Design a protein around this ligand. Structure first.
Ligand code: B12
Ligand code: B12
Ligand SMILES: Nc1ncnc2c1ncn2[C@@H]1O[C@H](COP(=O)(O)OP(=O)(O)OP(=O)(O)O)[C@@H](O)[C@H]1O
Ligand SMILES: C[C@H]1O[C@@H](n2cnc3c(N)ncnc32)[C@H](O)[C@@H]1O
Ligand SMILES: C[C@H]1O[C@@H](n2cnc3c(N)ncnc32)[C@H](O)[C@@H]1O
Ligand SMILES: [Mg+2]
Ligand SMILES: [Mg+2]
Ligand SMILES: [Mg+2]
Lengths: 183, 151, 181
């Protein structure tokens, strides 16, 4: 059977084998990363045409988010206690995001003021993804400040926020949609 | 402070949800589309007021919300029980926006009770949940869609 | 205008600030039900029975909302129908899961949220359901909420995963599969 029922009393396992209540910050961080990945999946379902580079990029990002969830599930202090290795989150994906950000940023008109979330279906979906990503970042920061998670995880999520904002503007520009401003 | 960051992020999440909902209106000329965009602007104001001993936040938008609520209420049949979140694409999206707005209100309340932000922000988010509920009902009615009540 | 001050009431008459755990739990259950509503608005084109199932789940979520709003420490006798959350719905979920499991190919690798609009929407619903479970667990481990509520949410996570897989299979969509590096 797909379920075990071992979590019916409200406890679950980390990747170090330690059992904690399901409201622990480790599970809040893992679950919010999962929620971000799901929002990105639904946004991916909105692309009308085929062969879009940024769709491949978003799928790569989803895989990286699975890796980020795995990292968050192995707290470093319990990995030292459990005799396990370090759980080092590498910087590759961050640099990749920075490259893609430069690519899209070089193509947009300069932006000076606040944007209302808008610009077509894809663009609005990506703005919602951006807000969920920032929530995930806020869930990861306390774990970093405790020494439980590599700081590169928070760096990746922070850079993904900017990637999603820039990609929303890029999609809006390509659709001929103008986004709104003011008060 | 972390609470300020959380409240601001949740108001931003609400505005983004409302934007995606707006993307579901297939016709132009809808007054409530303009109302939702004006609400997005007011949410920008809410976010700047939270990121301040606190910033003043005028109460006019709350009256705007109450007027719109009355306008829509006088067009709807009486409702005495809970309904299932439903009623067409726009109505369902607006129910989800209503849930996110109530989450944002929960994030703003402790800031107000600490005296770190103006109470009008909190009562705006409150009235806003009510506006979103009424507008979801109204959008469902205008499409001829069925209002599901479970007992 | 009641509650403009930041306070609200439980169904037992207790007044608490709106940031209390009970309101976080009830609000997240509401959010889950609304996400299911939107997913249902995508489903109403073809797929039949599982739309009935999703609506039943919404009704059950209204019942769990009633349970969470009636803390056991304050519950009088006339509130006993609300504090007792029966196990029926849980078993129903298991039944439905078994049904869909008999029609799917066996699962070997990790799945990315994908598989068409219905499937992706259900994956998002699953994530919101797990957030709701995390909000309900502190009330249960405090003795304020029937444990069957947490059991129901834990099983609903798996129901939604399996239903996403089923919708993707019926639409002919292949889900995307996790790949290292
Ligand atoms: C609170 C805050 C937010 C809140 C709410 C903001 C709101 N009012 O709706 C939230 C979380 C929503 C937010 C989001 C973003 N913000 Co912000 N935010 C701020 C903060 C702390 C104050 C802004 C504010 O409310 N000012 C008060 C109002 C009245 O001012 P305003 O007249 O509208 O003028 C502002 C803009 O013109 C902005 N501005 C100036 N230069 C630039 C350049 C660019 C490229 C942009 C986009 C804006 C911008 O700064 C002015 C003063 O704040 C500022 C930092 C600061 N400047 O003190 C950052 C700041 C404005 N934000 C910034 C960024 C990057 C963003 C995001 C793109 C981040 C993201 N990845 O999501 C989004 C934008 C999404 C959107 N437009 O909806 C940057 C902008 C410059 C840049 N480096 O690109 C700032 C300056 C922070 C920084 N120093 O890096 N933000
Ligand atoms: C817990 C709670 C919630 C939970 C819901 C839990 C659930 N069971 O689904 C959440 C946070 C989701 C919620 C949402 C809302 N609720 Co509420 N909620 C309550 C509360 C505290 C208890 C309700 C309950 O579980 N009763 C037990 C069940 C078994 O009772 P029931 O047989 O179904 O009977 C109830 C309904 O008929 C309700 N009722 C009576 N008149 C009206 C009118 C409307 C419009 C509605 C929706 C319900 C309603 O009152 C009865 C007794 O509780 C009550 C206040 C109270 N009763 O002390 C407010 C209350 C029922 N809610 C109210 C409101 C306004 C809402 C919202 C519209 C708020 C919003 N803007 O989103 C939504 C509606 C969502 C929907 N209909 O789908 C109002 C209803 C009256 C009114 N002011 O119009 C109440 C009375 C609070 C108040 N005094 O303002 N709520
Ligand atoms: N509600 C939740 N929110 C976030 N993460 C969770 C939640 N529940 C479990 N997890 C994490 O995801 C992993 C898989 O979840 P799963 O639901 O399969 O486990 P469980 O609920 O503890 O067991 P079961 O569901 O079989 O009773 C768990 O090992 C745990 O680390
Ligand atoms: C735009 C402004 O939002 C704040 N900020 C930075 N990261 C987050 C986040 N994850 N959530 C909410 N607010 C954030 C910073 O103060 C920045 O300047
Ligand atoms: C309808 C019922 O919902 C609860 N309630 C009131 N405000 C909120 C909020 N922001 N978030 C969640 N629940 C709330 C109260 O118990 C109210 O009576
Ligand atoms: Mg499992
Ligand atoms: Mg209210
Ligand atoms: Mg589980």
């Amino acid at each position: 059977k797909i379920y075990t029922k071992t979590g019916d009393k409200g406890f679950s396992s980390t990747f170090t084998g330690e059992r904690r209540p399901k409201d622990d910050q480790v599970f809040e961080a893992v679950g919010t990363t999962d929620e971000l990945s799901s929002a990105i999946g639904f946004a991916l379902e909105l692309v009308t045409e085929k062969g879009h580079t940024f769709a491949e990029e978003l799928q790569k990002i989803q895989c990286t988010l699975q890796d980020v969830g795995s990292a968050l599930a192995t707290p470093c202090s319990s990995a030292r206690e459990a005799h396990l290795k370090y759980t080092t989150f590498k910087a590759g994906p961050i640099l990749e995001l920075e490259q893609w950000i430069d690519k899209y940023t070089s193509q947009l008109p300069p932006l000076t003021a606040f944007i209302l979330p808008s610009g077509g279906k894809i663009s609005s979906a990506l703005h919602f993804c951006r807000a969920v990503c920032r929530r995930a970042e806020r869930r990861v920061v306390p774990l970093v400040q405790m020494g439980e998670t590599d700081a590169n995880v928070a760096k990746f999520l922070n850079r993904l926020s900017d990637y999603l904002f820039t990609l929303a503007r890029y999609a809006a520009m390509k659709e001929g949609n103008q986004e709104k401003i003011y008060m």
